[PDB]
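Hi again,

Forgot to attach this to my earlier email, sorry! This is the prediction with magnesium ion bound. I've pasted everything inline since the attachment limit keeps bouncing my files.
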Amino acid sequence: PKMKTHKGAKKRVKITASGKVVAMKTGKRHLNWQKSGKEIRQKGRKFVLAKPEAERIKLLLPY
Amino acid sequence: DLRPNPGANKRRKRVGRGPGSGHGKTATRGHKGQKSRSGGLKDPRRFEGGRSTTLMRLPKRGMQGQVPGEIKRPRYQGVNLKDLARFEGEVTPELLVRAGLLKKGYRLKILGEGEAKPLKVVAHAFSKSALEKLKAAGGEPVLLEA
Amino acid sequence: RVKMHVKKGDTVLVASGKYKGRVGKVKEVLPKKYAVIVEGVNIVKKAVRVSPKYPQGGFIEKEAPLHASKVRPICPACGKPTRVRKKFLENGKKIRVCAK
Amino acid sequence: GNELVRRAARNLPWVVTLAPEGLNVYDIVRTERLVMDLDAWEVFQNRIG
RNA sequence: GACCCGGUGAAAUUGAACUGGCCGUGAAGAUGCGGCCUACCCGUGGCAGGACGAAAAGACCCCGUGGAGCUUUACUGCAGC
RNA sequence: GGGAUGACCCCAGGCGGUAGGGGAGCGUUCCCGAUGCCGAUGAAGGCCGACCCGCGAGGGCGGCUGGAGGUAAGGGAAGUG
RNA sequence: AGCUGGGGCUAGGAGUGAAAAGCUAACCGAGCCCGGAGAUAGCUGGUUCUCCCCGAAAUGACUUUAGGGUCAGCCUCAGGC
RNA sequence: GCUGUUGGGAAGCAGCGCCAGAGAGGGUGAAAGCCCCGUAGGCGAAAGGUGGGGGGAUAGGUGAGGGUACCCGAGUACCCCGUGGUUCGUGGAGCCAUGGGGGAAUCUGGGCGGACCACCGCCUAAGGCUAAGUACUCCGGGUGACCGAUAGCGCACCAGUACCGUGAGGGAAAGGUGAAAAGAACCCCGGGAGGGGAGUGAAAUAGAGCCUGAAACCGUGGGCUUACAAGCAGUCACGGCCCCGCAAGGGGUUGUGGCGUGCCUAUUGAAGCAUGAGCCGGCGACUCACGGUCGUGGGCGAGCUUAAGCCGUUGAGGCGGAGGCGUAGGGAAACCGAGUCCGAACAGGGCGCAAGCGGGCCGCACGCGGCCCGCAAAGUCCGCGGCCGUGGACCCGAAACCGGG
RNA sequence: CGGGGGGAACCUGGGGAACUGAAACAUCUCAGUACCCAGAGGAGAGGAAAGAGAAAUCGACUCCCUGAGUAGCGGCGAGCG
Ligand SMILES: [Mg+2]
Ligand SMILES: [Mg+2]
Ligand SMILES: [Mg+2]
Ligand SMILES: [Mg+2]
Ligand SMILES: [Mg+2]
Ligand SMILES: [Mg+2]
Ligand SMILES: [Mg+2]
Ligand SMILES: [Mg+2]
Ligand SMILES: [Mg+2]
Ligand SMILES: [Mg+2]
Ligand SMILES: [Mg+2]
Ligand SMILES: [Mg+2]
Ligand SMILES: [Mg+2]
Ligand SMILES: [Mg+2]
Ligand SMILES: [Mg+2]
Ligand SMILES: [Mg+2]
Ligand SMILES: [Mg+2]
Ligand SMILES: [Mg+2]
Ligand SMILES: [Mg+2]
Ligand SMILES: [Mg+2]
Ligand SMILES: [Mg+2]
Ligand SMILES: [Mg+2]
Ligand SMILES: [Mg+2]
Ligand SMILES: [Mg+2]
Ligand SMILES: [Mg+2]
Ligand SMILES: [Mg+2]
Ligand SMILES: [Mg+2]
Ligand SMILES: [Mg+2]
Ligand SMILES: [Mg+2]
Ligand SMILES: [Mg+2]
Ligand SMILES: [Mg+2]
Ligand SMILES: [Mg+2]
Ligand SMILES: [Mg+2]
Ligand SMILES: [Mg+2]
Ligand SMILES: [Mg+2]
Ligand SMILES: [Mg+2]
Ligand SMILES: [Mg+2]
Ligand SMILES: [Mg+2]
Ligand SMILES: [Mg+2]
Ligand SMILES: [Mg+2]
Ligand SMILES: [Mg+2]
Ligand SMILES: [Mg+2]
Ligand SMILES: [Mg+2]
Ligand SMILES: [Mg+2]
Ligand SMILES: [Mg+2]
Ligand SMILES: [Mg+2]
Ligand SMILES: [Mg+2]
Ligand SMILES: [Mg+2]
Ligand SMILES: [Mg+2]
Ligand SMILES: [Mg+2]
Ligand SMILES: [Mg+2]
Ligand SMILES: [Mg+2]
Ligand SMILES: [Mg+2]
Ligand SMILES: [Mg+2]
Ligand SMILES: [Mg+2]
Ligand SMILES: [Mg+2]
Ligand SMILES: [Mg+2]
Ligand SMILES: [Mg+2]
Ligand SMILES: [Mg+2]
Ligand SMILES: [Mg+2]
Ligand SMILES: [Mg+2]
Ligand SMILES: [Mg+2]
Ligand SMILES: [Mg+2]
Ligand SMILES: [Mg+2]
Ligand SMILES: [Mg+2]
Ligand SMILES: [Mg+2]
Ligand SMILES: [Mg+2]
Ligand SMILES: [Mg+2]
Ligand SMILES: [Mg+2]
Ligand SMILES: [Mg+2]
Ligand SMILES: [Mg+2]
Ligand SMILES: [Mg+2]
Ligand SMILES: [Mg+2]
Ligand SMILES: [Mg+2]
Ligand SMILES: [Mg+2]
Ligand SMILES: [Mg+2]
Ligand SMILES: [Mg+2]
Ligand SMILES: [Mg+2]
Ligand SMILES: [Mg+2]
Ligand SMILES: [Mg+2]
Ligand SMILES: [Mg+2]
Ligand SMILES: [Mg+2]
Ligand SMILES: [Mg+2]
Ligand SMILES: [Mg+2]
Ligand SMILES: [Mg+2]
Ligand SMILES: [Mg+2]
Ligand SMILES: [Mg+2]
Ligand SMILES: [Mg+2]
Ligand SMILES: [Mg+2]
Ligand SMILES: [Mg+2]
Ligand SMILES: [Mg+2]
Ligand SMILES: [Mg+2]
Ligand SMILES: [Mg+2]
Ligand SMILES: [Mg+2]
Ligand SMILES: [Mg+2]
Ligand SMILES: [Mg+2]
Ligand SMILES: [Mg+2]
Ligand SMILES: [Mg+2]
Ligand SMILES: [Mg+2]
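Structure tokens for the complex follow:
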């Protein structure tokens, strides 16, 4: 019956216009105590490939 | 055209795959020949299997919702004057939904590229650069909703 | 009850097979076999004697049944089907032309 | 649409009969010749574009 | 009892068989490959070395994120107090 | 490449194969085609064949048996080998 | 502390037990029947017509993972270059 | 609707007719509109049911002003503790129920709008009843790209039977003579059984558990061929004998010679002394529904398409725009928008956008409009196919777990 | 005057699992399902707002299609909705 939208996905990925899948970099959630600004700074979304193909299949209906 | 004369075109490939016999897909029957594919795998859309799947990701989507749910908010749907320049007179919502754009999606917001046509256009909102384009003799019956 | 057909203990014409043409009477209607008797299809039945009584046994015997369809009634004319008239107080089977 | 005519043909082994508002492709093709009356050629029209 | 005659008349098993020995060879122990040796065809009473003989999808051993019974200062609950 | 699109011709290479992918076909049940067409001068099935067609699955035709059904081209479904 | 007939009572985590986990209708560490139920089985087995073209892998990383998997490597088909 | 003809038998075939609001179907010795039963169309209830569909008859119901403030459902509302219900699993946890404790007011009342408070609103708890639309199918009927006796219900048959078990309960097998019994008088061998004649029939190898009657299996007769040979039983080659046809050629058999390690499965590797199979026949495993993703045959395309349901048919389709996709991308969001997000930044950078035409024709501006076109800008809808998700999801198999007996 | 039992499914109410799924497992899932009990009937239930929730809105209940796999719930896991 009507396939279901994986809400665990719907909560960490925004699927783009060209079809690419986007999510936030992993790291800076609590890791830190002293990481270069460069590292803690360089965290603002990214690509994924062959793996997002899989992602998109879970976000069916919500296109 | 005769009765016993139609028949599909030349591609309705009824030929679905039959599992088999000595020649073609056979025995183990196309795919298989191993084990653990005998009743259905895990996903594998998610599997994976044992180790943490790309779920090592992280909910960004700040705000997923409280418990009463979604807040009754007014949604606005943009519609470039580009398309708007398909007909003339005095375009307005409803006349836009009935057309081929908008439709119940609530409040009308004209903008986008395209060359603004000399005529009155009623909307709930207008983009800055859109309002400009209606410079070449147009309109601006904003607000509405009363 | 419903089990009813076209003939009764009267005169009929065989349209059948071996006796096409032959004409006869009272066919002692069955109709569990939906057949009649007439005067034809009469086979030779062997006999030992169902009990010494009436000793000897011959081969000329009785008349066999005949599918009710193989026969056609006749009266004041020839073959022909049967219709039904109301007799102003009855229901008698009459033939298209004659009358019985 | 004339039931009287319909009733008259019908039993003919070579005749397939229909009411105008029943005009369908399958029948048109299973027969060799098609015969409509003007009042039925209209309903047909009110259905074509 | 077994053996023979008249009577009656089963079974597990069985890919099919036109089913020998020795040295070899081969998935490491071949009637079935090689080379050689032996050997007319078919039975009957006997023996039990082989057909990795039969029977039981090894009870030992390991594997399965299998199962049950049992234990406790393993976990988490519950009755009862 | 011929291209007179002749899907037939010469030229040039290639054509072992498990898991697998791909492409063509054969046959079975049923539906349209069927108020049709085959059928007692014999249906379906069965038993034969040293003949015909096809690379193959098969399709023919013939003799015997059988005794009342069978079902073209062209397509459609699926409890289909 | 005997043996025995007839009439009765106690049963499934329950009975009964001079205690073997014995016995509870010829296999009791949890009876039998029907049902949930087509339990589950990352295991074993089996998987049926024909021809033509191509044709692997048995590696790496991670895996309560190690005879199972996900991504990559290697095969195939369509389109493009 | 008769006749003739073939035939055991016409309904076949033939000649010349006929009915049709009926040419659905079944039967009759074979194939039939006119022989039979029916079919179209049309009639029919004294009696028993059913029955506002249509009539009636009842019960029942028909007001404004201004005063009073009398009454508006109690162990209830309400609050706290323990829980259930809802999408809500302690959550910011409201709402509806309520086992415990405490415990009101009567419209200047009391509940609700997701803690709570103030505004603005919504509604009247603690009494009961109420057709229709909806569900099901033991039963009757009508249909089938449903089955056709290993199928279809477990049962086409004297089946929930025979048999099994103490019991709950389990649970079979088994259909067909022929058109018609015309079911074989009588004679002969025999105790009978069973046969041989005779006789019936179109057919008796339709003779009675009898239509057809395959394969395994058991025999009788014949042809070739075998007791010095040895083998996955075959194959290639000659030769002999037998059989077909005039011949060339072909069929059967096999004496020598050459070459030869069953099938399946599982494996790095099997003739393997690894698995499975006695042989034959029949049953036996990748489907279907709804989603999804590609591909593909079409329709229409700045768009495409309906769902339920309604009207029609009774193998006839229409209507129905609720709704869904698509036409704007960004942001966590407010929001902005061909941009947008981070940023102080017109630095940068992440997502984004920027779609014509190969091109016949032709109004016949020395202008290509724009009709047209692939099927796009570009999508949708339906069909088909591959794979994926949810379902038992390729088929068969546990040891076990739980419920009621 | 009534009641008692029977009735294939269907219906309401009172109680109410587990295998499974989470590739272990306990919250969660299976599921208020299977099953037990009581009751009712050709249906049963529900039913005229101490309602919905944002609309100067609707106006009993039930049933179908959408809304929507949305809003939300979730060891924010499986999944539920
Ligand atoms: Mg920063
Ligand atoms: Mg959607
Ligand atoms: Mg296998
Ligand atoms: Mg393996
Ligand atoms: Mg294996
Ligand atoms: Mg399974
Ligand atoms: Mg009378
Ligand atoms: Mg003896
Ligand atoms: Mg050796
Ligand atoms: Mg040797
Ligand atoms: Mg050999
Ligand atoms: Mg001996
Ligand atoms: Mg011995
Ligand atoms: Mg031994
Ligand atoms: Mg090849
Ligand atoms: Mg292959
Ligand atoms: Mg037909
Ligand atoms: Mg003849
Ligand atoms: Mg057939
Ligand atoms: Mg099958
Ligand atoms: Mg005593
Ligand atoms: Mg127990
Ligand atoms: Mg029990
Ligand atoms: Mg005790
Ligand atoms: Mg004792
Ligand atoms: Mg005990
Ligand atoms: Mg015992
Ligand atoms: Mg146990
Ligand atoms: Mg279950
Ligand atoms: Mg099972
Ligand atoms: Mg299974
Ligand atoms: Mg697996
Ligand atoms: Mg198959
Ligand atoms: Mg190759
Ligand atoms: Mg892979
Ligand atoms: Mg290519
Ligand atoms: Mg004849
Ligand atoms: Mg005649
Ligand atoms: Mg003929
Ligand atoms: Mg007839
Ligand atoms: Mg007929
Ligand atoms: Mg005639
Ligand atoms: Mg009638
Ligand atoms: Mg009456
Ligand atoms: Mg008062
Ligand atoms: Mg709760
Ligand atoms: Mg709660
Ligand atoms: Mg209380
Ligand atoms: Mg209280
Ligand atoms: Mg309240
Ligand atoms: Mg409250
Ligand atoms: Mg409140
Ligand atoms: Mg409220
Ligand atoms: Mg509020
Ligand atoms: Mg309210
Ligand atoms: Mg009330
Ligand atoms: Mg009230
Ligand atoms: Mg009520
Ligand atoms: Mg009611
Ligand atoms: Mg119904
Ligand atoms: Mg049966
Ligand atoms: Mg049979
Ligand atoms: Mg029955
Ligand atoms: Mg049976
Ligand atoms: Mg017994
Ligand atoms: Mg004779
Ligand atoms: Mg016969
Ligand atoms: Mg017959
Ligand atoms: Mg027979
Ligand atoms: Mg035989
Ligand atoms: Mg012989
Ligand atoms: Mg010698
Ligand atoms: Mg010799
Ligand atoms: Mg040889
Ligand atoms: Mg093995
Ligand atoms: Mg291998
Ligand atoms: Mg061997
Ligand atoms: Mg072996
Ligand atoms: Mg093994
Ligand atoms: Mg095997
Ligand atoms: Mg064996
Ligand atoms: Mg077999
Ligand atoms: Mg077989
Ligand atoms: Mg689908
Ligand atoms: Mg698809
Ligand atoms: Mg930018
Ligand atoms: Mg199974
Ligand atoms: Mg119990
Ligand atoms: Mg009563
Ligand atoms: Mg219930
Ligand atoms: Mg309940
Ligand atoms: Mg209940
Ligand atoms: Mg559980
Ligand atoms: Mg589990
Ligand atoms: Mg639930
Ligand atoms: Mg009713
Ligand atoms: Mg009711
Ligand atoms: Mg009703
Ligand atoms: Mg009221």
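The two ends of chain B are 61 Å apart (CA to CA). Chains B and C do not touch (no CB pair under 8 Å).

That should be everything now.

G.
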